[PDB]
Every structure is written in C-alpha cells, then in structure tokens.
Amino acid sequence: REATWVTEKPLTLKIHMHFRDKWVWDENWPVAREVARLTNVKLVGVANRAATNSQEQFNLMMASGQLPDIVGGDNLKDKFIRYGMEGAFIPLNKLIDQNAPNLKAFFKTHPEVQRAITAPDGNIYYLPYVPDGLVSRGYFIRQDWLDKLHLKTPQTVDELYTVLKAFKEKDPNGNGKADEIPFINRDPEEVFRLVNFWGARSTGSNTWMDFYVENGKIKHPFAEVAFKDGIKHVAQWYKEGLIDPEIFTRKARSREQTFGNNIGGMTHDWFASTALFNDALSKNIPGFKLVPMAPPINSKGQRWEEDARQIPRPDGWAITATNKNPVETIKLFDFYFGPKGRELSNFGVPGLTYDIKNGKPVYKDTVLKAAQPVNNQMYDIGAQIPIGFWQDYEYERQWTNDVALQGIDMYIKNKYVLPQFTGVNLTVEEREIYDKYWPDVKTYMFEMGQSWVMGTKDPEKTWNDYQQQLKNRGFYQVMIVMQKAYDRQY
C-alpha cells in the first residue's frame, strides 16, 4: 500500500500505444513498472509490435473491434478530437475538475495549453505531451571538412551549394573514394524544409506540413507558388547528389550511419543529440567537428530557422468509452503531473538511470558518458515517451554539451526562429469539412512532394494538375474554413 495509490484493489488496463513508427508501450519498462507500483495501476499494451506505421495502427485498432481502455501516441490530436466527438473517447473536463488536482492546477496556469487541446464542442479528449524549452533544431556542418578543404562557413545559399558540391567531389575524408553525402537527415520531411533556402515555407510549426499565417491570411506551404519554384531547386540538389539519395528511406539512425562512417557533411536537427556526436565519435574520427551554423541567407535575403519547440505537441493519450474505470484512469494520469510522476516520466527510475543528490534528479555518469543520446536511452525504459506528460528541460540540460549550448544561445540571441503558427479553433461544422478532406489531402501533398524531389515528376509540368487535384480533393474547402476560424479570432 502506498499514499500515491489511486485505487486499493490492484487495477490493470489495456493500452494501445504505437508511436514514432517503431515503438509500443511495454509494461516491462522500468518506468512503467515503477508507476504501476506507486499507483497500483498496471497498463498492458496491445499494439502490433511488428508495425511500421503508427497512424495505420491507430486506424487498424479503430476497426479491430472492442477498443482498449487507453490510446496514446504521437500526432494523434486530430484523431483524438475527431473520434472523441464521435464518442470513441470520453470528455475529461469533469473528471479533471473533480479528481485531478495536479492537472487542474497545471491548466489554470497554462490557459494556452488547455485551449490548444480543446475540441470544437469545448471538450478535452486527451492529455498532451507538453515539451519544455525554446529552440529545437538548427543547422550543423562539418567544420573539420571545411578546414580540410580550406572553405569558409557558407553565409548564403549559393556559397552553401559550393560547399556541399565540394564535400561531394573533393574527397574530404581523404580515402580516395566518392563516398561523401553532403546533406543527411533522420527526418525525411527535412528535405521539404530545404525550400526555405529559396524563400518558401514547408510548415508553420513543429507539426509537419502545418499551415502558417502571413498578413492575416491562412496559407499552406505545399499549395503556394513559392513551393513550386523552391522544390525545383531541391530536386536539382537531389539530382546532383548533394542531398542524401536515401533521404526518404534512411530515417532514424541516419546520424550514426553517416557521421559514424565519416561520410555525412551537414544536417538540420535538434541541438543536444546532434552535438553529442562530437563526443561519441572523438575516439574513432579524431578531427570530427560537427558545429552549429546560422541558417544561410536565403533568396529572400533572410536567415530562417523555421522550427521551434511546440508547446503543447499534438501528442498524448486519451480514455476510451469502453474504459470501465475512468476515475481511476484520470487519477493515474494526474499522477504524471505531480512532482514524483513528472520526475519519473522525464528521468527514468531512481537508482537506475539517476539518483537524487542535493535533492535534485541527477543522471548517473554511465548514462551521460554513453554513446547513445540521453533521450534515446529514456525511450528504451519508458521515459520521454509521447504520453500525457510535462517535460522538464532540466533533464535535457544535463546532456547538452558546450557545442550545443553555444548553438542554442546563438539562435536565441540572433532571433532566427520564425513566429510559429498557434493554430485556430474550428466550430463543429468547420471541423466536419476539416476531418473529411484534410487527412487525404495531406497524404497526397507528401506523395507529390516526394515525386518532385526525386524527379519522377516535374513540379513545373505538373503544377496545374496538382492544383486541380487539391481542388477536387477539397483542399480549398478546408482553406476557407481555416480562414473563417482565423478571422473569428483576430
């Protein structure tokens, strides 16, 4: 028996949580078992472990019969809202005010967050993953390769093109082989962000292919003429091999592969984990020096850093209408917003991954000296996972080295980060159009995007057909409701 118990008799619930296309909830996780012990509530996963698409799995579950008790994961906000209104997920407003003091307090002081997760009917259908921090990604380039080739840090897109071209043809790793890949990225979507170099947006926030606002008008990056011209340039860089040919397939371990084998020359990724490669590779590649660099001046004469930490993220978990124990569930959820629950969800297990010293959670040296970035380590034990939790930046500071810190401070000080889209609140009627067309349009945009990048389709020759399809697929119907909602507020 524990004072943190949310129920006297032991309670086990089923959870479907497939996330980031490669992970599933594991009751075996140290963190999970630690929370079970402290709350007397144990969660058992039911997600298909051999799945490669989390979203597909959510749909599969939505059509596999009786739903589990809890559903969680990344990029589920729209599904939580859509099916929440359909009655698949229950409203949490009441449950919170009456049984979740930690959350009621959090929302009271975080009105923007509460608004961001509220549905058109005014109901809260899930608890979000709430990131902590300001900046997210930044550009990194091989300083040792620049020095080896006697090149200066590229300040413009034209200078960058010359640098990447040199990386490709001048054998910087000096093994006499043309094995260098100028630009690499673990996120395929970052290839689309390259259009920034030519004054075109790729997304309005940390949420991929999100809308943005410009002079009181809602716009979507993939529908703009600037994207047509910008993507032509990206396609060219891809054809010339300046961009990793496996950009859409490599994914997750692109850094360990390309930097580890000394063939990657530049990327655009999160500061902390990316800078760590300098420490992880120092022994094998002596001169290895991956450093942050300001965004190059684009075709519009500006240095853009389009990405920023998003608070909250469209990630989290909800309670299904089939959950026979809703009050205990919300209490379990509330535990995560208390001091001990938040600590576990961020650092892992005390005595395992960290220890309390001077009263503060302090990571063990075995974790800090590991070859694997600290967040990857947390994922392995059930921490820093996209459930409904409040991230604590202190967990990140401990493994943010001086190189990363310098880059972070440079971006903050120089204000390269573009204003982020804070979204809009649609009425039920407006949301109906949104849920009917947006999902499929988004899918189509990505597909067209890859085709343009890989040269299987010429953006110039297919633009009119593309615009016609966006129309036929209801994209402009979605755009109109978005604009009506935007004005309804500003």
List of residues contacting Ca ion (CB under 5 A): 171, 173, 175, 177, 179
Minimum distance from residue 369 beta carbon to Ca ion (Å): 30
Structure token pair of residue 50 = 């051999």
Q: For Ca ion, which is the closer residue by CB, 80 or 183? A: 183
Q: For Ca ion, which is the closer residue by CB, 263 or 448? A: 263
Structure token pair of residue 204 = 């309005």
Q: For Ca ion, which is the closer residue by CB, 180 or 343? A: 180
In this structure, the number of other CB atoms found within 10 A of the CB of residue 214 comes to 11
Q: Provide the pairing of β-strand 137-142 with 354-357.
A: unpaired
Minimum distance from residue 174 beta carbon to Ca ion (Å): 6
Q: For Ca ion, which is the closer residue by CB, 68 or 265? A: 265
Residue 23 bridge partners (DSSP) = 19
Residue corresponding to tokens 């990630």: 315
H/E stretch holding 139 reads: strand 137-142
Q: For Ca ion, which is the closer residue by CB, 173 or 205? A: 173
CB of 356 closer than 8 Å to CB of 391: no
Burial of 268 per CB tally in 10 Å (0-12, 13-18, 19+): buried
Q: For Ca ion, which is the closer residue by CB, 21 or 171? A: 171
Which residue of this chain has its Cβ atom nearest to Ca ion in the complex?
171
234: amino acid identity, one letter:
V
Can you tell me whether residue 107 is helix, strand or coil?
helix
Minimum distance from residue 173 beta carbon to Ca ion (Å): 4
Minimum distance from residue 82 beta carbon to Ca ion (Å): 50
Minimum distance from residue 286 beta carbon to Ca ion (Å): 16
Minimum distance from residue 354 beta carbon to Ca ion (Å): 41
Residues with Cβ within 8 Å of 279's Cβ and at least 6 positions away in sequence, in order, are 401
Q: For Ca ion, which is the closer residue by CB, 171 or 394? A: 171
Compute CA distances 434 → 146, 186, 428, 475, 480, whole Å: 47, 30, 10, 9, 10
Minimum distance from residue 330 beta carbon to Ca ion (Å): 57
Helical ranges in 214-310 per DSSP H: 225-239, 254-258, 271-281
Residues with Cβ within 8 Å of 147's Cβ and at least 6 positions away in sequence, in order, are none
Q: For Ca ion, which is the closer residue by CB, 170 or 232? A: 170
Start-to-end CA span in the chain (Å): 52
In this structure, the number of other CB atoms found within 10 A of the CB of residue 105 comes to 13
Minimum distance from residue 244 beta carbon to Ca ion (Å): 15
Burial of 246 per CB tally in 10 Å (0-12, 13-18, 19+): middle
Dist CA 105 CA 385 (whole Å): 23
CB of 90 closer than 8 Å to CB of 326: yes
The alpha carbon torsion through 232, 235, 237, 238 (nearest 10 deg) reads: 180
Minimum distance from residue 169 beta carbon to Ca ion (Å): 10
Q: For Ca ion, which is the closer residue by CB, 173 or 203? A: 173
Dist CA 338 CA 99 (whole Å): 13
Q: For Ca ion, which is the closer residue by CB, 173 or 207? A: 173
Q: For Ca ion, which is the closer residue by CB, 179 or 429? A: 179
Minimum distance from residue 207 beta carbon to Ca ion (Å): 38
Minimum distance from residue 249 beta carbon to Ca ion (Å): 22
Nearest to 251 by CA among 312, 303, 160, 188: 188
Minimum distance from residue 177 beta carbon to Ca ion (Å): 5
Compute CA distances 141 → 150, 153, 183, 230, 287, whole Å: 14, 9, 9, 22, 13
Dist CA 11 CA 275 (whole Å): 43
Positive or negative torsion for Cα 416, 418, 419, 425:
negative
Q: For Ca ion, which is the closer residue by CB, 168 or 313? A: 168
69 phi/psi in degrees, rounded to 5: -90, -30
